[PDB]
């Protein structure tokens, strides 16, 4: 049934996209939304949020099970993952446990803040899109009423103005808000992965027993949204 749900969701997104595309009506909505958003976020912050969203949509997060397998491999011994490699280098160069904990917690908080900022930017976009669609619709109505010449053109031109409103909704509920929700999900996934990596690195550095730390990692896997999958 997973394939059926994926196909129906993709088909709904596709039909909404062809309803979206037409060029000017979306342009008004996006221009107004961008203008209002840039009063709260700088241009650099907006591009950072767009980069975070692109990374979260194109690339996939590392599975926690493979992370556990690698962690136990290194624990029994004594990596493509960037955070894992950084932690390994920090612990192998020679440092106290407190320094490693501080560095890893700082990186975790940095990633959490970046994903929260991206979520905030896209939620602001979702909040402000329908208002701008409505403003464009009202401007179109004013133009249509001040250029009222043919009854046969009352219908179609009206439908053009209302089109702007539609786009706002189609952008608010199906583009920006889903992107923010996906960013929140990616934040949760990356926080779980980095917390697992930090715990494993501390266990390896502190020479803890592999069995108890493995059980600890399973306990970490058996919480959050992941509870529904067990």
């Amino acid at each position: 049934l997973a394939t059926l749900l994926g196909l129906i969701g993709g088909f709904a997104f596709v039909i909404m996209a062809m309803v979206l595309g037409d060029v000017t009506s979306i342009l008004i909505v996006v221009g107004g939304s961008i203008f209002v958003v840039l009063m709260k976020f700088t241009m650099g912050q907006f591009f950072g949020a767009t980069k975070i969203a692109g990374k979260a949509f194109m690339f996939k997060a590392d599975e926690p099970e493979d992370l556990i397998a690698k962690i136990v491999e290194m624990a029994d011994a004594a990596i493509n993952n960037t955070f894992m490699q950084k932690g390994i280098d920090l612990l192998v160069d020679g440092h106290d446990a407190d320094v490693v904990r501080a560095a890893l917690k700082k990186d975790i908080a940095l990633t959490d803040e970046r994903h929260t900022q991206g979520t905030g930017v896209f939620r602001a976009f979702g909040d402000v899109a329908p208002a701008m669609g409505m403003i464009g619709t009202l401007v179109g109505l004013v133009a249509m009423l001040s250029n009222m010449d043919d009854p046969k053109a009352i219908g179609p031109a009206m439908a053009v103005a209302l089109l702007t409103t539609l786009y706002g909704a189609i952008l608010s509920n199906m583009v920006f808000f889903p992107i923010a929700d996906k960013l929140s999900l990616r934040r949760d996934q990356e926080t779980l992965n980095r917390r697992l990596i930090m715990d494993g690195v501390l266990a390896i550095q502190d020479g803890q027993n592999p069995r108890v730390i493995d059980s600890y990692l399973k306990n970490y896997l058996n919480e959050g949204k992941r509870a529904l999958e067990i």
Partner: protein, 47 residues
């Protein structure tokens, strides 16, 4: 609560409906067009 723009949405919807009421104030009913509309709507709702 509701989205902050729902007040403007209700405003716009009411404005459009009242413009249509104004348009109907000086309209004239057509029986053949009504029959065509009724047939099309019967076809649409699966009747």
């Amino acid at each position: 609560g509701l989205p902050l723009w729902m007040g403007t949405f209700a405003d716009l919807m009411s404005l459009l409906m009242c413009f249509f009421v104004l348009l109907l104030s000086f309209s004239e009913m057509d029986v053949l067009k009504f029959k065509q509309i009724a047939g099309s709507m019967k076809f649409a709702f699966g009747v």
